[PDB]
């Protein structure tokens, strides 16, 4: 609405007016603490230590360097709520003075002026209402032509380069002109925007900030292409052609990139009909789907998607992207905002390609350091000023502090992948929010300590967020989107998914040469079901049901692993492999029996469409379990057989490390397998989740001996605290960052005493780092072991920054964590937010509680040793069976375990009796059926031996 | 309104032992109905 | 000995007002206890683990409050106080509160007006009985008053 | 005037609450400076703790200065009860002054603040002003309230507060534009919009 | 018992009777909340003397690998891993939980590990503790007899 | 502070011989100065950034440890209890140089702004306030005696 | 004999010049400001 140019100016027109210097100290009250802003009393020492606000206005009024002959203006620029601001009701009202706690008065100088620059006062109360000028900002006052008026002048003054840019600029700006008048392109084209869906709430500024950053390119492409012909420097003609086009081009994206492909459609003919720029004569091709070539022309944007043939070793790798109309479409656009340092954002469904497309742009942008910041509800700016501590230096300028990366001649990129997850307050703001927008509208923020100005040079900032109607996910401020565009990347389509995951079929299909036909019905079997359990399974039920072209990614080089050691394998074992792997994938995260039923049944049912003329029992066989235990190779193995050598294995367990028997049942079995896997992959990490007792450490232990991984938890107490977790976690990252030690890191979400563990969790789970973890003497010891490490691996690394890279690499490859936590629908739900590296770092397995199956198993198989044979044992009419599979006609011992099934599953009845009625009721856990059959066995052969 | 076990065992031992009532009274039947009418008036008395 | 819960130091004047007394017979009464829940369940469980002298007594002011914990409620005797029940009940908690030998002083007409001051404190707390009607809000005419 | 001014015979405190803008710091202070005091304002906020209101209070007992509190129902629900210990005692002190018995030529008046015997002077007080309408503001604990005598400080003359400033500033037409000017605020707080 | 008990008995009898039940095998009280506790649970780890903790509303996660029984059997030891020290289990070791709350929730991790022994009051036995104490009061010479 | 109070030696005997030591190199420092009073002989001394840099911090350290002195001197005027703790050393260290004393009246009193000194500022002739109105005394304060 | 030589100047200058060098002079200066201020004595300075 320009009121910070309306007091800027002001302010330097006072200077002239009046011969008053004048100085403004801008604040943002909500960025920082609100210790942070008037001083904190130590509770122990009772010492005073200012704080920002106190800081700026007692050095005011000390007066050493003349302060008090200048018109001095303290502007809260940032969000107004109670908390804050009503520490200044003595300061705005007749009293003048501010008070603080240690009794000390502080009292306004005549040349003080204190200002709030807000853009609402829905959380203000009347007493701070009351006691403050009033000038309302309408945004009619800040009129559209007026913002051209000023792109056009900057373009017409200011150099881009740092003159041959400056007349490119000039003879462009002259082209714009007529489609930057008041009722022209742009202006008609905003209006119709305005009037369309958003991923994210529309603004002008938005808008127009994105399309003054790109035509700032355009005049660079014209620049570039100059160097490249510097015997013919593009004329004014060919410069025309080129600007109109372009300038088309900018507007559909910088208006229309944040929406659906129809509504980008939609903006495309409304705009072809009231434009003038000649347009692609394509009958049914949407404007969008063209780029501008430096020769003036339109170019289908599928001039530049090949059909690549991918080398077979690089089969769905992480840095591996097809390429599709939306990749290379989005890639410029990204190339385009971070070529000219624009924070951006990208907006879509998790797993729908933003950090891919991101990663993919800045491979064509060189001299530029991506560092990857993993927002989490609890995330406040100290995850941001940890990051520049370790990758940036403070120094001392003339002009004042300046933040610079360490490296030289690079820009540093600070990606924030869940941007819109840090907490909202109770009055509508996010601190680390605020942070971000002083950094980027004010080129700096306020080093707390010393309550000192920063600059930031040589650092852009790039965020990554879902939807904000998503669970857990809330709006970003328009004082923040106005500096930021926002393009919004979706799912790719049937087509798109077809054409990216059919190139990697092909190339991971050329390792069997007889498999080559079977490429395409390969893709399609996994099209079809991923879509299918993409619809069935939503956030609605479960909020762990995300099904994303991860899965897809996951899917391919799951059958890839299975497939490299193989010599030869006939279609019936690639479907059991494409069955397998669509059961870990898809079925392991599911809660109830129904949906697991259904995935199961669905499974047969796509495969077969796609896959006639196979043998359905040889390739579709229930009980599909995949091992590399019984061999060297990972393929197909036995139930009895997998049974006989995990029994083996066990055996040396108990002597080994951990002399708990266990019984074997089915479900173990395959749960085993499925941790057997998570810790052969990098950055494995797994979320295990069901009831206590189940078993989920336990296994999880022995198959980290399974795997020649140590076993670390933590071992809290009652006065187990953060720095106590945080020096846990250097122990476990020295040893796996340093000493090339393998480490499946099992903590429970009893361990979680604070939320700050989770949040450390979060960043660890991502990056394999904590970018704040090891400081002072602890940094300079890592350095040290990290250079020993790296020099037992034959790496001549010296450099503190080569190290660290080192260092983070051993801890993807080597820490496993293993999360467990109980079923808990709110909790579940809410753990999302706190650490959702969680659901989207680590492989979900609901165990769950034990089931009816599972009981009987167990219940028959440590009921062995019991004399349970009554051959004289009647089975009645009406049987009380409880397990479905019982034989239909039962044995007497058949008898007994299925009444042992029912009498535990009375509990689960009984629990919810008593609390239905409000009673007070205890966990019924699979440990009560351990302790049931235990007792009975122990009983039985009391008695037994007593009476005999 | 949380009670313990002690607390009504508190006023049992008081109607027994601490009543005014029983100062001279000797029939153990009139004794009991004494018991029996002040247990109620004092699990009202303090209780409330 | 009387102490306010809520400050740090009004802890450790309370641990060492109640040791002290329970040596010696003295009186400690602790105030606002219903702002210090968590340190509530911790004097619960101190004071289950004590013979003090028989004189001792401990006094604990609270708020009815769903804060205070279960286990301290039935460890201790629970007194509810609350505005009277009625007009008569008023007028007799006020007369028994006021020493007699503060209304028979020397003028023998101050007796009349500590009984209309009675009435009327009775007429004006019952009033808040009727949310509404005896008064537009519910005012806390009280002991101070 | 009448109520705090039969606060302070009583040796309590002055605890004048109402919305915003209706005088209540300034009436405190007008009180005081017609009582030639010096008064001391603080903006209170959460960070006025037990060991911060007692170090105000021995500045204020020792000088002899009025206390007024401002907001002093954003201090914490448990500070609030802690402060009310050393409100008290600090009475008790005020009332030892009060005392015919006493002499001047004696031993001073005392009381204990953060465990030191402070002298208090007779001519401090201490004020609170609060909003007791501002939701999540804390409510003061009964045992600290007793230690106040309170006023409505609600509806401010709005007409006699600016016949009387138009008149001293030497408007001669003062009844004329009160008449208008304090209407004309009234009309303006509900026919424009909200 | 297969897991450890967790008694639950406000009148504070079952806490007579474990302590009365373990003399002879010198039984020690304790509780979370107690500054010896570490070295109480190490000592009857260590000696394998039966030890009754108190406060089991105030759970120390320490105690996770001894009620899961995760021990360690090499080299002719039997281990168990107290914290970050190995402790040499004696197969006479015995733990008993106590609270003196009935309301207590406990998370479902440690109701997993503990067997509920719970003590409630039962109107057969208040009837019989009733009937006796009036005999105890009103027929001397019946109630001895 | 550390000249014109003896009994801060006794009180800090580290702060008193920790300023003294800094106080040395600043006064050797000075001397320098007044040999060479040009801005570029000064300018060129060697590594006189850094030992002006490091006399800032050291003279920091020195005013952060006089709290516990500063709250002794306010018990002498407690006036001073309404002053911070680094206004306070600037009244207390300037108490010879009384025009540094004006702006701190208005902390310390009502509506005192400013003192009237006669021409030796040794006699306090009386108070002035903000808006220059002034208040003789009739008995003058002699600041000498 | 190199067991002597540490010997013979820890016992005659309660110090060795060499024995604290890299990271554990870093660590030694971070030990011995924490240990001066549990003693009351602002040094910071590495040789004080
Ligand atoms: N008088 C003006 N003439 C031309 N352009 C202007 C004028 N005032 C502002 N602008 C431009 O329009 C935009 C207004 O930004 P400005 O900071 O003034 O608005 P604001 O309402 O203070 O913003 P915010 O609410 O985000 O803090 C900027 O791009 C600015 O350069
Ligand atoms: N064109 C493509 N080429 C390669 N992989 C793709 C392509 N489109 C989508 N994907 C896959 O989609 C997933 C996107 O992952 P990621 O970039 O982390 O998503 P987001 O940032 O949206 O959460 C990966 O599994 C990636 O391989
Ligand atoms: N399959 C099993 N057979 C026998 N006992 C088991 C089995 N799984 C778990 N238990 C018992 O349950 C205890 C708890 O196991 P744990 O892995 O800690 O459970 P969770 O991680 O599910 O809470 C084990 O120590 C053991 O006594
Ligand atoms: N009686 C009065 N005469 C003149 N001005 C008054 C009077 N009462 C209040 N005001 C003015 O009203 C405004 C608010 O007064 P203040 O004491 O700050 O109110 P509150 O404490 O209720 O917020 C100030 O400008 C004050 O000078
Ligand atoms: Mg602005
Ligand atoms: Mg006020």
């Given at each position: 609405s320009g009121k910070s140019m309306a007091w800027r100016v002001l302010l330097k027109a006072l200077e002239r007016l009046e011969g008053v210097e004048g100085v403004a100290h801008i604040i943002?009250?909500?960025?920082?603490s609100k210790d942070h802003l008037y001083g904190t009393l130590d509770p122990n020492t009772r010492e005073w230590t200012d704080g920002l606000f106190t800081h700026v206005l007692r050095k005011i009024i000390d007066?050493?360097?003349?302060?008090?002959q200048k018109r001095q203006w303290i502007v809260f620029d940032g969000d107004v709520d109670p908390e804050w601001v009503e520490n200044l009701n003595s300061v705005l009202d007749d009293n003048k003075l501010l008070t603080l706690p240690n009794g000390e008065r502080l009292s306004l100088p005549p040349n003080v002026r204190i200002m709030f620059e807000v853009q609402?006062?829905?959380?203000?109360t009347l007493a701070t209402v009351s006691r403050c000028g009033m000038v309302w900002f309408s945004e009619?006052?800040?009129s559209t032509d007026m913002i051209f008026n000023n792109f056009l002048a900057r373009l017409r003054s200011?150099?881009?380069?740092?003159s041959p840019m400056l007349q490119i600029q000039r003879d462009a700006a002259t082209i714009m002109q007529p489609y930057f008048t008041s009722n022209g392109l742009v202006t008609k084209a905003l209006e119709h925007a305005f009037q369309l869906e958003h991923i994210m709430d529309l603004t002008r500024l938005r808008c127009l900030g994105s399309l003054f950053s790109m035509l700032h390119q355009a005049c660079r492409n014209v620049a570039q292409y100059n160097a490249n012909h510097p015997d013919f420097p593009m004329q004014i003609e060919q410069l025309e052609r080129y600007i109109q086009r372009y300038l088309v081009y900018a507007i559909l994206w910088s208006l229309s990139?944040?929406?659906?492909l129809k509504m980008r459609a939609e903006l495309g003919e409304y705009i072809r009909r009231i434009t003038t720029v000649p347009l692609p004569?394509?009958?049914?091709?949407?404007?969008?789907?063209y780029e501008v070539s430096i020769s003036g022309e339109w170019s289908p944007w599928?001039?530049?998607?090949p059909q690549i043939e991918v080398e077979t070793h690089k089969v769905?790798?992480?840095?591996v992207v097809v390429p599709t109309l939306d990749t290379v479409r989005h890639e410029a656009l990204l190339y385009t905002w971070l070529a000219e340092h624009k924070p951006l954002v990208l907006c879509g469904?998790?797993?729908?390609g933003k950090t891919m497309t991101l990663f993919s742009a800045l491979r064509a942008l060189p001299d530029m350091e991506v560092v990857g910041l993993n927002f989490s509800?609890?995330?406040?700016?100290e995850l941001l000023l940890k990051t520049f501590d370790h990758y940036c230096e403070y120094r001392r300028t003339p002009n004042g502090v300046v933040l610079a990366p360490?490296?030289?001649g690079k820009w540093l990129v600070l990606f924030?992948?869940?941007?819109?997850?840090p907490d909202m307050d109770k009055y509508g703001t996010q601190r680390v929010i605020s942070f971000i927008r002083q950094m980027v509208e004010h080129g700096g923020f306020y080093?707390?300590?010393?309550?000192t100005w920063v600059k930031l040079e040589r650092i852009q900032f790039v965020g990554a967020c879902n939807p904000?109607?998503?669970?857990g996910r809330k709006p970003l401020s328009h004082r923040f989107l106005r500096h930021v565009p926002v393009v919004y990347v979706d799912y790719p389509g049937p087509a798109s998914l077809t054409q990216i995951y059919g190139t990697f079929n092909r190339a991971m299909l050329r390792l069997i040469?007889?498999?080559?036909?079977?490429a395409e019905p390969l893709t399609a079997a996994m099209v079809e079901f991923y879509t299918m359990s993409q619809e069935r399974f939503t956030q609605d039920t479960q909020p762990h049901y995300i099904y994303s072209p991860r899965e897809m990614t996951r899917w391919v080089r799951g059958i890839f692993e299975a497939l490299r050691p193989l010599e030869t394998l006939p279609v019936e074992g690639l479907i059991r492999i494409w069955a397998h792997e669509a059961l870990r994938l898809?079925?392991?995260?599911?809660?109830?029996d129904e949906e697991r039923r259904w995935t199961d049944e669905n499974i047969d049912t796509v495969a077969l469409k796609h896959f006639?003329?196979?043998?359905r029992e040889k390739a579709m066989?229930?009980?599909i379990l995949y091992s590399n235990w019984l061999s060297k190779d990972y393929i197909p193995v036995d139930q009895e057989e997998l049974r006989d050598y995990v029994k083996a294995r066990l055996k040396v367990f108990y002597e080994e490390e951990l002399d708990v028997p266990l019984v074997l049942f089915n479900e173990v079995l395959d749960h085993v397998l499925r941790i057997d896997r998570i810790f052969r992959?990098?950055?494995?990490h797994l979320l295990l989740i069901g009831?206590?007792?189940?078993?989920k450490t336990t296994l999880s232990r022995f198959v980290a001996w399974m795997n020649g991984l140590s076993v670390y938890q933590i071992k809290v107490?009652?006065?187990?605290?953060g720095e106590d977790f945080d020096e846990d976690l250097r122990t476990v990252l020295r040893r796996?960052?340093?000493?090339n030690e393998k480490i499946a890191f099992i903590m429970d979400?009893?361990?979680?005493?604070?939320s700050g563990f989770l949040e450390r969790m979060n960043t660890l789970l991502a990056?394999?780092?904590?970018?704040?973890?090891?400081?002072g003497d602890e940094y300079a010891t890592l350095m040290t072991q990290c250079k020993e490490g790296a020099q037992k691996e034959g790496l001549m690394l010296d450099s503190h920054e080569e190290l660290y890279k080192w260092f983070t690499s051993q801890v993807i490859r080597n820490l496993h964590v293993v999360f467990t936590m109980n079923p808990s629908s709110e909790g579940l739900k809410d753990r999302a937010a706190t650490s959702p590296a969680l659901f989207n770092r680590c492989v979900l397995n609901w165990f769950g509680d034990w089931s009816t199956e599972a009981l009987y198993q167990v219940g028959k198989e440590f009921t062995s040793?019991?004399?349970?044979?009554?051959?004289?044992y009647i089975v009645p009419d009406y049987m009380p069976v409880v397990?479905?599979?019982?034989?239909?006609?039962?044995?007497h011992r058949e008898a007994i375990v299925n009444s042992c099934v029912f009498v535990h599953q009375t509990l689960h009845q009984a629990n919810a009796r008593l609390a239905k009625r409000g009673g007070r009721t205890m966990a019924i856990t699979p440990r009560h059926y351990l302790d049931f059959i235990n007792h009975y066995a122990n009983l039985f052969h009391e008695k037994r031996s007593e009476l005999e | 309104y949380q009670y313990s076990l002690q607390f009504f065992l508190d006023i049992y031992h008081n109607v027994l032992?601490?009543?005014?009532?029983?100062?001279?009274?000797?029939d153990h039947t009139q004794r009991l109905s004494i018991i029996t009418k002040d247990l109620f008036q004092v699990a009202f008395n303090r209780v409330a | 000995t009387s102490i306010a819960i809520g400050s740090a130091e009004g802890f450790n004047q309370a641990d060492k007002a109640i040791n002290t007394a329970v040596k010696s017979g003295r009186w400690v009464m602790l105030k606002?206890?219903?702002?210090?829940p968590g340190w509530l369940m911790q004097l619960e469980k101190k004071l289950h683990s004590l013979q003090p002298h028989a004189c001792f007594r401990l006094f604990l002011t609270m708020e009815?409050?769903?804060?205070?914990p279960v286990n301290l409620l039935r460890a201790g005797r629970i007194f509810v106080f609350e505005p009277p029940p009625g007009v008569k009940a008023n007028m007799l908690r006020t007369f028994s509160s006021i020493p007699v030998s503060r209304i028979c002083?020397?003028?023998?007409?101050r007796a009349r007006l500590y009984f209309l001051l009675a009435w009327f404190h009775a007429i004006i707390q019952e009033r808040?009985?009727?949310?509404?009607?005896?008064?537009?809000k519910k005012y806390e005419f009280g002991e101070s008053d | 005037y009448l109520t705090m001014t039969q606060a302070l015979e009583a040796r309590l405190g002055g605890s004048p609450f109402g919305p915003?803008?209706?005088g209540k710091t300034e009436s405190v202070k007008a009180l005081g400076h017609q009582l030639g005091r010096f008064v001391l304002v603080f903006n209170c906020d959460?960070?006025?703790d037990f060991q911060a209101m007692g170090r105000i209070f021995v500045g204020l007992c020792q000088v002899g200065a009025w206390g007024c509190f401002?907001?002093?129902?954003?201090?914490?629900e448990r500070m609030l009860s802690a402060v009310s210990q050393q409100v008290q005692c600090i009475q008790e002190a005020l009332r030892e002054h009060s005392?015919?018995?006493?002499?001047?030529?004696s031993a001073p008046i005392t009381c204990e603040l953060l465990n030191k015997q402070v002298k208090v002077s007779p001519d401090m007080a201490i004020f609170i002003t609060m909003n007791?309408?501002?939701?999540?503001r804390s409510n003061l604990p009964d045992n600290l309230k007793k230690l106040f005598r309170s006023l409505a400080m609600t509806k401010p003359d709005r007409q006699l507060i600016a016949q009387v400033m138009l008149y001293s500033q030497g408007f001669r037409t003062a009844e004329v534009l009160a008449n208008k000017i304090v209407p004309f605020f009234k009309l303006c707080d509900e026919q424009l919009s909200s | 018992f297969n897991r450890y008990p967790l008694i639950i008995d406000p009148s504070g009898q079952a806490t007579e009777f474990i302590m009365n039940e373990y003399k002879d095998r010198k039984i020690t009280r304790t509780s979370?909340?107690?500054?010896?506790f570490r070295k109480n649970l190490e000592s009857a780890l260590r000696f394998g003397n039966p030890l009754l903790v108190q406060d089991?509303?105030?759970?120390?996660?320490?105690?996770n690998p001894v009620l899961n029984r995760e021990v360690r059997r090499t080299g002719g030891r039997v281990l168990i891993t107290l914290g970050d020290q190995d402790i040499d289990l004696s197969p006479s070791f015995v733990i008993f939980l106590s609270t003196r709350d009935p309301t207590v929730e406990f998370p479902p991790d440690l109701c997993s590990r503990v067997t509920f022994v719970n003590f409630t009051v039962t109107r057969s036995s208040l009837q019989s503790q009733c009937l006796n104490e009036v005999l105890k009061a009103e027929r001397p010479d019946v109630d001895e007899k | 502070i550390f000249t014109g109070s003896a009994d801060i030696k006794h009180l800090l005997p580290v702060e008193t011989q920790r300023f003294q030591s800094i106080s040395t190199e600043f006064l050797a420092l000075m001397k320098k100065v007044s040999k060479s009073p040009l801005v570029m002989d000064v300018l060129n001394i060697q590594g006189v950034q850094r030992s002006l840099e490091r006399l800032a911090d050291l003279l920091g350290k020195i005013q952060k440890a006089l709290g516990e002195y500063l709250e002794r001197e306010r018990s002498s005027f407690?006036?001073?209890?309404?002053?911070?703790d680094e206004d306070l050393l600037e009244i207390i260290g300037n108490s010879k140089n009384?025009?540094?004393?004006?702006?701190?009246?208005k902390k310390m009193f009502a509506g005192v702004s400013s003192i009237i000194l006669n021409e030796d500022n040794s006699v306090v002739l009386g108070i002035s306030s903000r808006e220059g109105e002034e208040v003789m005394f009739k008995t003058p304060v002699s600041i000498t005696e």
């Open positions: 943002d009250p909500k960025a920082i007066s050493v360097r003349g302060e008090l609402d006062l829905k959380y203000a009619d006052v800040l200011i150099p881009l380069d740092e990139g944040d929406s659906r004569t394509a009958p049914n091709i949407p404007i969008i789907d599928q001039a530049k998607v769905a790798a992480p840095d469904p998790p797993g729908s509800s609890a995330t406040t700016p360490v490296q030289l924030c992948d869940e941007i819109n997850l080093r707390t300590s010393d309550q904000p109607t998503d669970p040469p007889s498999l080559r036909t079977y898809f079925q392991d995260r599911l809660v109830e006639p003329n196979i043998d066989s229930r009980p992959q990098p950055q494995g009831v206590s007792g189940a078993g107490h009652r006065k187990y605290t796996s960052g340093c000493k979400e009893s361990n979680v005493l604070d990056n394999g780092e904590v970018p704040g973890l090891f400081e040793k019991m004399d349970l044979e009554k051959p004289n397990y479905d599979k019982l034989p239909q006609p039962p044995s | 032992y601490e009543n005014p009532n029983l100062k001279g009274v000797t | 606002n206890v219903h702002l210090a009815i409050n769903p804060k205070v002083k020397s003028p023998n007409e808040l009985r009727y949310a509404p009607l005896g008064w537009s | 915003a803008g209706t959460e960070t006025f401002d907001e002093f129902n954003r201090l914490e005392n015919p018995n006493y002499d001047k030529t007791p309408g501002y939701a999540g | 979370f909340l107690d500054d010896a089991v509303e105030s759970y120390d996660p320490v105690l | 407690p006036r001073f209890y309404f002053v911070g009384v025009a540094k004393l004006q702006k701190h009246f």
